Amino acid sequence: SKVCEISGKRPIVANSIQRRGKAKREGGVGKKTTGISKRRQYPNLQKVRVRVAGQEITFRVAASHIPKVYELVERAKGLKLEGLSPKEIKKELLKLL
Amino acid sequence: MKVILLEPLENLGDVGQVVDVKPGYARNYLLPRGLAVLATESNLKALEARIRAQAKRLAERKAEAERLKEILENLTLTIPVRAGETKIYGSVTAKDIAEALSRQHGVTIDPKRLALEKPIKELGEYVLTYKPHPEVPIQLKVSVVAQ
RNA sequence: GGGCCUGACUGCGAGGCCUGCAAGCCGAGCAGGGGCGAAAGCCGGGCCUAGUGAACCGGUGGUCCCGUGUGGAAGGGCCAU
RNA sequence: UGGUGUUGGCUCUUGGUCGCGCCUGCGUAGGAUAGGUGGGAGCCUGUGAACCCCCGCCUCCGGGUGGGGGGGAGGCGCCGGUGAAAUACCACCCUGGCGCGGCUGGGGGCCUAACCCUCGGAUGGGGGGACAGCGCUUGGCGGGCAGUUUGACUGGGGCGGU
RNA sequence: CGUAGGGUUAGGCGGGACCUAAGGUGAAGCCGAAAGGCGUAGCCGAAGGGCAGCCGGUUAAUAUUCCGGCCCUUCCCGCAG
RNA sequence: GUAGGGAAACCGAGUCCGAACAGGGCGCAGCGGCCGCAAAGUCCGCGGCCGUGGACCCGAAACCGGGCGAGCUAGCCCUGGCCAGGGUGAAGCUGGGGUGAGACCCAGUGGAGGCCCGAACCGGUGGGGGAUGCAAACCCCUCGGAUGAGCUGGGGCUAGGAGUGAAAAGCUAACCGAGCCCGGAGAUAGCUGGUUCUCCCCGAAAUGACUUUAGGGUCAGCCUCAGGCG
RNA sequence: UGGUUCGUGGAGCCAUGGGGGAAUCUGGGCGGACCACCGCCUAAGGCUAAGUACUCCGGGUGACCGAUAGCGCACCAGUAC
RNA sequence: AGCCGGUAGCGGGCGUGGAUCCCUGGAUGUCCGAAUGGGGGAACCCGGCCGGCGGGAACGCCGGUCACCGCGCGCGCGGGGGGAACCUGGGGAACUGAAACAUCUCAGUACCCAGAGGAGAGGAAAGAGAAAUCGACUCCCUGAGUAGCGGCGAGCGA
Ligand SMILES: [Mg+2]
Ligand SMILES: [Mg+2]
Ligand SMILES: [Mg+2]
Ligand SMILES: [Mg+2]
Ligand SMILES: [Mg+2]
Ligand SMILES: [Mg+2]
Ligand SMILES: [Mg+2]
Ligand SMILES: [Mg+2]
Ligand SMILES: [Mg+2]
Ligand SMILES: [Mg+2]
Ligand SMILES: [Mg+2]
Ligand SMILES: [Mg+2]
Ligand SMILES: [Mg+2]
Ligand SMILES: [Mg+2]
Ligand SMILES: [Mg+2]
Ligand SMILES: [Mg+2]
Ligand SMILES: [Mg+2]
Ligand SMILES: [Mg+2]
Ligand SMILES: [Mg+2]
Ligand SMILES: [Mg+2]
Ligand SMILES: [Mg+2]
Ligand SMILES: [Mg+2]
Ligand SMILES: [Mg+2]
Ligand SMILES: [Mg+2]
Ligand SMILES: [Mg+2]
Ligand SMILES: [Mg+2]
Ligand SMILES: [Mg+2]
Ligand SMILES: [Mg+2]
Ligand SMILES: [Mg+2]
Ligand SMILES: [Mg+2]
Ligand SMILES: [Mg+2]
Ligand SMILES: [Mg+2]
Ligand SMILES: [Mg+2]
Ligand SMILES: [Mg+2]
Ligand SMILES: [Mg+2]
Ligand SMILES: [Mg+2]
Ligand SMILES: [Mg+2]
Ligand SMILES: [Mg+2]
Ligand SMILES: [Mg+2]
Ligand SMILES: [Mg+2]
Ligand SMILES: [Mg+2]
Ligand SMILES: [Mg+2]
Ligand SMILES: [Mg+2]
Ligand SMILES: [Mg+2]
Ligand SMILES: [Mg+2]
Ligand SMILES: [Mg+2]
Ligand SMILES: [Mg+2]
Ligand SMILES: [Mg+2]
Ligand SMILES: [Mg+2]
Ligand SMILES: [Mg+2]
Ligand SMILES: [Mg+2]
Ligand SMILES: [Mg+2]
Ligand SMILES: [Mg+2]
Ligand SMILES: [Mg+2]
Ligand SMILES: [Mg+2]
Ligand SMILES: [Mg+2]
Ligand SMILES: [Mg+2]
Ligand SMILES: [Mg+2]
Ligand SMILES: [Mg+2]
Ligand SMILES: [Mg+2]
Ligand SMILES: [Mg+2]
Ligand SMILES: [Mg+2]
Ligand SMILES: [Mg+2]
Ligand SMILES: [Mg+2]
Ligand SMILES: [Mg+2]
Ligand SMILES: [Mg+2]
Ligand SMILES: [Mg+2]
Ligand SMILES: [Mg+2]
Ligand SMILES: [Mg+2]
Ligand SMILES: [Mg+2]
Ligand SMILES: [Mg+2]
Ligand SMILES: [Mg+2]
Ligand SMILES: [Mg+2]
Ligand SMILES: [Mg+2]
Ligand SMILES: [Mg+2]
Ligand SMILES: [Mg+2]
Ligand SMILES: [Mg+2]
Ligand SMILES: [Mg+2]
Ligand SMILES: [Mg+2]
Ligand SMILES: [Mg+2]
Ligand SMILES: [Mg+2]
Ligand SMILES: [Mg+2]
Ligand SMILES: [Mg+2]
Ligand SMILES: [Mg+2]
Ligand SMILES: [Mg+2]
Ligand SMILES: [Mg+2]
Ligand SMILES: [Mg+2]
Ligand SMILES: [Mg+2]
Ligand SMILES: [Mg+2]
Ligand SMILES: [Mg+2]
Ligand SMILES: [Mg+2]
Ligand SMILES: [Mg+2]
Ligand SMILES: [Mg+2]
Ligand SMILES: [Mg+2]
Ligand SMILES: [Mg+2]
Ligand SMILES: [Mg+2]
Ligand SMILES: [Mg+2]
Ligand SMILES: [Mg+2]
Ligand SMILES: [Mg+2]
Ligand SMILES: [Mg+2]
Ligand SMILES: [Mg+2]
Ligand SMILES: [Mg+2]
Ligand SMILES: [Mg+2]
Ligand SMILES: [Mg+2]
Ligand SMILES: [Mg+2]
Ligand SMILES: [Mg+2]
Ligand SMILES: [Mg+2]
Ligand SMILES: [Mg+2]
Ligand SMILES: [Mg+2]
Ligand SMILES: [Mg+2]
Ligand SMILES: [Mg+2]
Ligand SMILES: [Mg+2]
Ligand SMILES: [Mg+2]
Ligand SMILES: [Mg+2]
Ligand SMILES: [Mg+2]
Ligand SMILES: [Mg+2]
Ligand SMILES: [Mg+2]
Ligand SMILES: [Mg+2]
Ligand SMILES: [Mg+2]
Ligand SMILES: [Mg+2]
Ligand SMILES: [Mg+2]
Ligand SMILES: [Mg+2]
Ligand SMILES: [Mg+2]
Ligand SMILES: [Mg+2]
Ligand SMILES: [Mg+2]
Ligand SMILES: [Mg+2]
Ligand SMILES: [Mg+2]
Ligand SMILES: [Mg+2]
Ligand SMILES: [Mg+2]
Ligand SMILES: [Mg+2]
Ligand SMILES: [Mg+2]
Ligand SMILES: [Mg+2]
Ligand SMILES: [Mg+2]
Ligand SMILES: [Mg+2]
Ligand SMILES: [Mg+2]
Ligand SMILES: [Mg+2]
Ligand SMILES: [Mg+2]
Ligand SMILES: [Mg+2]
Ligand SMILES: [Mg+2]
Ligand SMILES: [Mg+2]
Ligand SMILES: [Mg+2]
Ligand SMILES: [Mg+2]
Ligand SMILES: [Mg+2]
Ligand SMILES: [Mg+2]
Ligand SMILES: [Mg+2]
Ligand SMILES: [Mg+2]
Ligand SMILES: [Mg+2]
Ligand SMILES: [Mg+2]
Ligand SMILES: [Mg+2]
Ligand SMILES: [Mg+2]
Ligand SMILES: [Mg+2]
Ligand SMILES: [Mg+2]
Ligand SMILES: [Mg+2]
Ligand SMILES: [Mg+2]
Ligand SMILES: [Mg+2]
Ligand SMILES: [Mg+2]
Ligand SMILES: [Mg+2]
Ligand SMILES: [Mg+2]
Ligand SMILES: [Mg+2]
Ligand SMILES: [Mg+2]
Ligand SMILES: [Mg+2]
Ligand SMILES: [Mg+2]
Ligand SMILES: [Mg+2]
Ligand SMILES: [Mg+2]
Ligand SMILES: [Mg+2]
Ligand SMILES: [Mg+2]
Ligand SMILES: [Mg+2]
Ligand SMILES: [Mg+2]
Ligand SMILES: [Mg+2]
Ligand SMILES: [Mg+2]
Ligand SMILES: [Mg+2]
Ligand SMILES: [Mg+2]
Ligand SMILES: [Mg+2]
Ligand SMILES: [Mg+2]
Ligand SMILES: [Mg+2]
Ligand SMILES: [Mg+2]
Ligand SMILES: [Mg+2]
Ligand SMILES: [Mg+2]
Ligand SMILES: [Mg+2]
Ligand SMILES: [Mg+2]
Ligand SMILES: [Mg+2]
Ligand SMILES: [Mg+2]
Ligand SMILES: [Mg+2]
Ligand SMILES: [Mg+2]
Ligand SMILES: [Mg+2]
Ligand SMILES: [Mg+2]
Ligand SMILES: [Mg+2]
Ligand SMILES: [Mg+2]
Ligand SMILES: [Mg+2]
Ligand SMILES: [Mg+2]
Ligand SMILES: [Mg+2]
Ligand SMILES: [Mg+2]
Ligand SMILES: [Mg+2]
Ligand SMILES: [Mg+2]
Ligand SMILES: [Mg+2]
Ligand SMILES: [Mg+2]
Ligand SMILES: [Mg+2]
Ligand SMILES: [Mg+2]
Ligand SMILES: [Mg+2]
Ligand SMILES: [Mg+2]
Ligand SMILES: [Mg+2]
Ligand SMILES: [Mg+2]
Ligand SMILES: [Mg+2]
Ligand SMILES: [Mg+2]
Ligand SMILES: [Mg+2]
Ligand SMILES: [Mg+2]
Ligand SMILES: [Mg+2]
Ligand SMILES: [Mg+2]
Ligand SMILES: [Mg+2]
Ligand SMILES: [Mg+2]
Ligand SMILES: [Mg+2]
Ligand SMILES: [Mg+2]
Ligand SMILES: [Mg+2]
Ligand SMILES: [Mg+2]
Ligand SMILES: [Mg+2]
Ligand SMILES: [Mg+2]
Ligand SMILES: [Mg+2]
Ligand SMILES: [Mg+2]
Ligand SMILES: [Mg+2]
Ligand SMILES: [Mg+2]
Ligand SMILES: [Mg+2]
Ligand SMILES: [Mg+2]
Ligand SMILES: [Mg+2]
Ligand SMILES: [Mg+2]
Ligand SMILES: [Mg+2]
Ligand SMILES: [Mg+2]
Ligand SMILES: [Mg+2]
Ligand SMILES: [Mg+2]
Ligand SMILES: [Mg+2]
Ligand SMILES: [Mg+2]
Ligand SMILES: [Mg+2]
Ligand SMILES: [Mg+2]
């Protein structure tokens, strides 16, 4: 319920629009709005744990950008990552974005 | 999802083959256990350039062995021994033929490859396969003679 | 009471009644195509006064007026309900 | 609460669909049980015949069709009976059914590795487990809360009446 | 009360250079559009724990604080065991 | 502004409805002896009144946003403190009795309890006083609890549709059925009030219709001013 | 869902939380559903003066005020209270 | 050619060898504050390390230095906080109006928050939209209360 670390996808505000009535195209009198109230639409945030340079790195990422994580690992094969901490590996992974 | 198998897995495919499986299978079983790699375009050339290079080293064996099948099959290794009538007092071994094909005719050869279980204990004219590479077996004519 | 019928018209409408508005009401006459009558003529529902509901939004039939570069189409307008 | 994403493996079982083997098709008339349109004036037998009997299957009650054995070489069409179409043989497809497969819909069972819980030990063990949680979406219940509405005349107002 | 001058003296009294309580804060970590919310340790947090001074005299005004008497604590250095 | 008519296509001093060349709707138009001159229309000034805006001025009860408050009060948490004196005399214990052993009875010991009387302390029952008070809750007399669900110091946490409540919609800083401050903000008020020099001419209405209208409005009626008619 | 004049409307365009998910100019997006024709334009990387806004500050100028006015404050005022 | 602020006085001084005073630069600048050694009830308290001072080891004082985060190959550069309005972005009411009220309006306004700078934003066409046309963006005038949107109501408005 926050921020995709790969895409930057963020919780956005949306309206919930309650309607009644038969649509004009169905031959009806037309749609009437019985209510409009704000709500939030969240990214489909999921945990993705991967191993890089021996250490275990966790990403909080929207489902839409899950393959972008595994790509970052392949692109991380050509980096001097050995011996760094997980916090340091993550920064190097995201730097390759 | 397309992947490149690193190993032959039952009813899945052969090593180095590009198969298509479900995302979760590849992400939470195969790729973590080293059983397959993502069929990305980048390492899809890595696969291709191994298929390429491995075929190159092999056809270089089948065309270096062929040149060694030209020198042999077009000569005869005459071997002089001490022999009584037909039985030899000593024996001519594959090692002997090799060390014979050295000093004579110039070609050094691998003894352990020649097809000869027991040492030759009689005179005559023998036809001995070499096999420096399968499907390329060199027939060598070796003539055991006395004195 | 009976005969033939569909004027329980279409296109209009001088002139008025009533009246704050918007409505309601009466209407001769002209044309189109008719009904009845020999004809003069009558006929635009019903002896009369109640039996009703402005807009908006939408349905249906027709019209073929608009059609977002152009031809169409979507969707509207108009007449009728 | 349905669909769907995160969400995967194996199997069994029913469903649907194509691929393939296929086999199934019953009037009067007409050999007999004629799926249809073409191709068709021939195919078939040491890829052993007319037929004797044991085996499943299909039986509109004739059979049909699949094996096996004996024997081991002739049998059906073209003709005509014949019907709307009429026959050996070769394709395309039609009915329905079955089997091996695709590819998926449900269902049952099991797995583990996502995900969740846990364990002085943690690139691990244990438990749950593709469920639950969570994201998008569907319909529902919903004074827990929120915004409001709840007409006028009237011998005051309400009540009644209008 | 107005103006001015003077008056509050501590190693031992109370607080701090000690400790922890609720609670607050908060490396690690978790969460949230932003602001921020949480959070084991640790830190802060007292009138609780801990810790060595009694009696008398003196000033216009301070006194376990100055003075007198008799005591005591910690730190540093050194000596001896 | 110089062209209008039609939903429009379009036509145009016409156009629209229509079969119409019918009828109707809406449209189409200076004075003198070329010039003055008066004029479409238009520009600017000025004045009346209307629309928009807080719109003549002052006034709500309220609604919303962001902060500020538990030094009062409510509850809890941590850590300390306090409760004279007297009375009642549970269990247990011991001894005696009792019995097959017991139950149990009696005396002594004992010291329990949202036990009793009563100060401190915590309350606030009835009456009187007070009522521009000593006091925006006080005073006198009386009265309830006073080892407990007791009282109290210090240190803390919980708050506004929220807290806390042995529950009274009580309390959350002397007015709480939704705190306070600042902001939206000059909210809105068809209601009440108020509206400031002088003189001159005219001079009403309180009806009708309709109205979630009835003490408010739109139109008409009635008043007034300018132009015109006569 | 939002933005736009567009409140579901025939609803395109621009943006995007969810699902699916391409191509490299013979590719692609747009001209208000959609299709054809004809044109326009090159998304998914970034930067870029000037013309524009404001007035704590400085100056200049008022058919602006003149101590109940003009800033809340002409004065020791964000003060006393 | 006077001067030691408002500020006179007391008691003392300074200036044509150029004072006071005005401008520019520099020096000094206690303690708190982003506040940053640590703590904290701002302006107080308590430390480590190196150097100095005292008879100085205990004690105290003086100078230097020591927060956290980001970025780069232990050392560097950067960040933090503030500013009257103005700006952009992320969130975002209600009274009110519709003579009731819910869609709608008030309004993407008030306000909160993040960031920016002397401005900010936008900006070099996957534009416009019918001109066989134009040629980044910003801003003013106009187009125009037009086109349209709208319980086709109130209103909104390119
Ligand atoms: Mg919804
Ligand atoms: Mg519709
Ligand atoms: Mg339609
Ligand atoms: Mg609607
Ligand atoms: Mg998650
Ligand atoms: Mg995962
Ligand atoms: Mg998506
Ligand atoms: Mg996807
Ligand atoms: Mg009659
Ligand atoms: Mg009759
Ligand atoms: Mg007739
Ligand atoms: Mg008339
Ligand atoms: Mg009338
Ligand atoms: Mg009537
Ligand atoms: Mg009528
Ligand atoms: Mg006639
Ligand atoms: Mg006639
Ligand atoms: Mg006639
Ligand atoms: Mg006749
Ligand atoms: Mg006639
Ligand atoms: Mg007539
Ligand atoms: Mg009648
Ligand atoms: Mg009659
Ligand atoms: Mg009648
Ligand atoms: Mg109507
Ligand atoms: Mg309406
Ligand atoms: Mg309509
Ligand atoms: Mg039509
Ligand atoms: Mg047309
Ligand atoms: Mg068109
Ligand atoms: Mg065409
Ligand atoms: Mg056309
Ligand atoms: Mg057509
Ligand atoms: Mg049409
Ligand atoms: Mg009609
Ligand atoms: Mg659901
Ligand atoms: Mg799923
Ligand atoms: Mg299981
Ligand atoms: Mg398991
Ligand atoms: Mg497990
Ligand atoms: Mg289990
Ligand atoms: Mg699930
Ligand atoms: Mg759905
Ligand atoms: Mg729902
Ligand atoms: Mg309800
Ligand atoms: Mg309610
Ligand atoms: Mg309201
Ligand atoms: Mg109502
Ligand atoms: Mg009602
Ligand atoms: Mg009502
Ligand atoms: Mg009433
Ligand atoms: Mg009455
Ligand atoms: Mg009456
Ligand atoms: Mg009365
Ligand atoms: Mg009365
Ligand atoms: Mg009633
Ligand atoms: Mg005094
Ligand atoms: Mg003195
Ligand atoms: Mg002393
Ligand atoms: Mg001490
Ligand atoms: Mg010390
Ligand atoms: Mg301390
Ligand atoms: Mg401590
Ligand atoms: Mg952190
Ligand atoms: Mg915290
Ligand atoms: Mg804690
Ligand atoms: Mg400490
Ligand atoms: Mg402490
Ligand atoms: Mg203490
Ligand atoms: Mg103590
Ligand atoms: Mg002490
Ligand atoms: Mg002592
Ligand atoms: Mg003295
Ligand atoms: Mg004294
Ligand atoms: Mg003294
Ligand atoms: Mg002493
Ligand atoms: Mg020693
Ligand atoms: Mg017109
Ligand atoms: Mg006419
Ligand atoms: Mg017409
Ligand atoms: Mg006329
Ligand atoms: Mg003139
Ligand atoms: Mg004029
Ligand atoms: Mg007016
Ligand atoms: Mg206003
Ligand atoms: Mg006003
Ligand atoms: Mg006005
Ligand atoms: Mg309200
Ligand atoms: Mg309300
Ligand atoms: Mg409310
Ligand atoms: Mg608040
Ligand atoms: Mg208190
Ligand atoms: Mg309290
Ligand atoms: Mg305690
Ligand atoms: Mg206690
Ligand atoms: Mg206590
Ligand atoms: Mg007591
Ligand atoms: Mg007692
Ligand atoms: Mg007692
Ligand atoms: Mg006692
Ligand atoms: Mg006793
Ligand atoms: Mg006892
Ligand atoms: Mg006893
Ligand atoms: Mg006893
Ligand atoms: Mg007692
Ligand atoms: Mg006693
Ligand atoms: Mg009690
Ligand atoms: Mg008691
Ligand atoms: Mg008692
Ligand atoms: Mg006492
Ligand atoms: Mg009390
Ligand atoms: Mg008290
Ligand atoms: Mg009291
Ligand atoms: Mg009480
Ligand atoms: Mg009393
Ligand atoms: Mg009494
Ligand atoms: Mg009393
Ligand atoms: Mg008395
Ligand atoms: Mg009284
Ligand atoms: Mg009294
Ligand atoms: Mg009183
Ligand atoms: Mg009293
Ligand atoms: Mg008393
Ligand atoms: Mg008493
Ligand atoms: Mg008493
Ligand atoms: Mg009692
Ligand atoms: Mg008592
Ligand atoms: Mg007592
Ligand atoms: Mg008692
Ligand atoms: Mg107690
Ligand atoms: Mg207490
Ligand atoms: Mg307390
Ligand atoms: Mg306190
Ligand atoms: Mg609480
Ligand atoms: Mg609170
Ligand atoms: Mg608060
Ligand atoms: Mg409130
Ligand atoms: Mg509030
Ligand atoms: Mg409520
Ligand atoms: Mg509540
Ligand atoms: Mg209570
Ligand atoms: Mg207050
Ligand atoms: Mg109160
Ligand atoms: Mg009260
Ligand atoms: Mg109030
Ligand atoms: Mg309220
Ligand atoms: Mg409220
Ligand atoms: Mg209060
Ligand atoms: Mg404020
Ligand atoms: Mg306002
Ligand atoms: Mg007001
Ligand atoms: Mg109101
Ligand atoms: Mg006035
Ligand atoms: Mg008069
Ligand atoms: Mg009247
Ligand atoms: Mg009316
Ligand atoms: Mg009515
Ligand atoms: Mg009425
Ligand atoms: Mg009324
Ligand atoms: Mg009345
Ligand atoms: Mg009224
Ligand atoms: Mg009037
Ligand atoms: Mg008159
Ligand atoms: Mg008049
Ligand atoms: Mg006149
Ligand atoms: Mg969409
Ligand atoms: Mg919208
Ligand atoms: Mg529409
Ligand atoms: Mg749209
Ligand atoms: Mg829309
Ligand atoms: Mg799109
Ligand atoms: Mg998206
Ligand atoms: Mg192209
Ligand atoms: Mg293309
Ligand atoms: Mg596009
Ligand atoms: Mg398009
Ligand atoms: Mg375009
Ligand atoms: Mg188009
Ligand atoms: Mg373009
Ligand atoms: Mg490009
Ligand atoms: Mg830019
Ligand atoms: Mg320039
Ligand atoms: Mg600039
Ligand atoms: Mg600029
Ligand atoms: Mg300027
Ligand atoms: Mg100025
Ligand atoms: Mg003046
Ligand atoms: Mg003056
Ligand atoms: Mg004054
Ligand atoms: Mg003043
Ligand atoms: Mg004066
Ligand atoms: Mg000033
Ligand atoms: Mg003032
Ligand atoms: Mg003043
Ligand atoms: Mg003052
Ligand atoms: Mg002075
Ligand atoms: Mg002097
Ligand atoms: Mg002097
Ligand atoms: Mg000089
Ligand atoms: Mg300076
Ligand atoms: Mg100093
Ligand atoms: Mg400082
Ligand atoms: Mg500090
Ligand atoms: Mg600190
Ligand atoms: Mg030192
Ligand atoms: Mg020293
Ligand atoms: Mg220092
Ligand atoms: Mg230091
Ligand atoms: Mg900041
Ligand atoms: Mg800033
Ligand atoms: Mg800044
Ligand atoms: Mg914004
Ligand atoms: Mg942001
Ligand atoms: Mg927003
Ligand atoms: Mg904003
Ligand atoms: Mg809100
Ligand atoms: Mg509202
Ligand atoms: Mg308002
Ligand atoms: Mg209005
Ligand atoms: Mg308004
Ligand atoms: Mg209203
Ligand atoms: Mg109203
Ligand atoms: Mg109301
Ligand atoms: Mg409203
Ligand atoms: Mg709006
Ligand atoms: Mg503002
Ligand atoms: Mg500039
Ligand atoms: Mg810029
Ligand atoms: Mg470019
Ligand atoms: Mg114009
Ligand atoms: Mg708007
Ligand atoms: Mg404009």
Side-chain angles (χ1 to χ4, degrees), chain A residues 15-35:
Chain A
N15 281 336
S16 175
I17 304 185
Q18 297 310 289
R19 315 178 184 266
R20 274 115 135 288
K22 203 203 305 292
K24 286 182 186 191
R25 58 188 296 148
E26 295 167 34
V29 111
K31 306 300 287 180
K32 304 304 195 164
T33 300
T34 173

Side-chain angles (χ1 to χ4, degrees), chain A residues 2 16 23 25 36 40-41 56 60 66-67 74 92:
Chain A
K2 240 193 126 36
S16 175
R25 58 188 296 148
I36 292 172
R40 306 175 80 213
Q41 299 177 311
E56 194 165 283
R60 303 171 70 254
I66 290 201
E74 312 279 56
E92 294 296 328

Side-chain angles (χ1 to χ4, degrees), chain A residues 2-86 88-94 96-97:
Chain A
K2 240 193 126 36
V3 187
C4 174
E5 304 173 336
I6 312 303
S7 76
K9 277 189 197 175
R10 178 160 305 264
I12 65 162
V13 171
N15 281 336
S16 175
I17 304 185
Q18 297 310 289
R19 315 178 184 266
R20 274 115 135 288
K22 203 203 305 292
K24 286 182 186 191
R25 58 188 296 148
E26 295 167 34
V29 111
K31 306 300 287 180
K32 304 304 195 164
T33 300
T34 173
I36 292 172
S37 82
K38 284 166 176 292
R39 47 75 60 107
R40 306 175 80 213
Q41 299 177 311
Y42 297 89
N44 195 7
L45 225 274
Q46 304 292 345
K47 274 181 173 189
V48 172
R49 312 183 300 116
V50 297
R51 290 203 81 85
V52 167
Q55 289 275 177
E56 194 165 283
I57 318 298
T58 47
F59 288 86
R60 303 171 70 254
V61 57
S64 66
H65 282 60
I66 290 201
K68 237 39 178 44
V69 175
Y70 292 84
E71 155 166 6
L72 271 188
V73 180
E74 312 279 56
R75 306 190 43 157
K77 294 277 225 302
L79 276 93
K80 269 178 163 154
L81 297 195
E82 294 294 298
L84 325 169
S85 67
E88 295 170 81
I89 302 164
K90 201 173 190 185
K91 296 204 171 198
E92 294 296 328
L93 268 243
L94 299 177
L96 269 190
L97 274 157

Side-chain angles (χ1 to χ4, degrees), chain B residues 11-55 57-66 68-69 72-94 96-98 100-111 114-117 119-134 136-140 142:
Chain B
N11 315 120
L12 236 170
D14 179 51
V15 48
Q17 187 192 341
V18 171
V19 295
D20 201 308
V21 295
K22 290 176 150 51
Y25 195 18
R27 288 197 282 255
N28 302 319
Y29 188 80
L30 300 175
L31 268 65
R33 299 165 186 266
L35 314 183
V37 176
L38 230 41
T40 81
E41 122 178 341
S42 71
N43 51 20
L44 212 45
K45 304 173 182 171
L47 162 77
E48 184 177 305
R50 298 318 297 245
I51 280 184
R52 182 184 296 109
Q54 191 221 343
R57 60 136 200 109
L58 175 73
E60 167 54 39
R61 304 296 133 260
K62 200 161 276 287
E64 241 202 275
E66 270 317 317
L68 215 74
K69 193 165 182 285
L72 322 181
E73 278 194 348
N74 264 41
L75 57 81
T76 48
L77 198 51
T78 249
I79 303 201
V81 299
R82 274 197 181 277
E85 168 71 294
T86 35
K87 69 272 173 181
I88 312 171
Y89 301 86
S91 64
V92 31
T93 63
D96 289 355
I97 287 149
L101 229 219
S102 144
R103 314 149 32 256
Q104 182 177 326
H105 295 171
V107 164
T108 94
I109 232 47
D110 163 54
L114 202 61
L116 174 124
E117 48 185 46
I120 301 163
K121 219 55 171 61
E122 306 237 29
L123 290 170
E125 316 288 287
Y126 299 92
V127 39
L128 289 211
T129 87
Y130 188 32
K131 306 185 285 76
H133 179 304
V136 185
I138 307 175
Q139 291 268 72
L140 221 221
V142 187

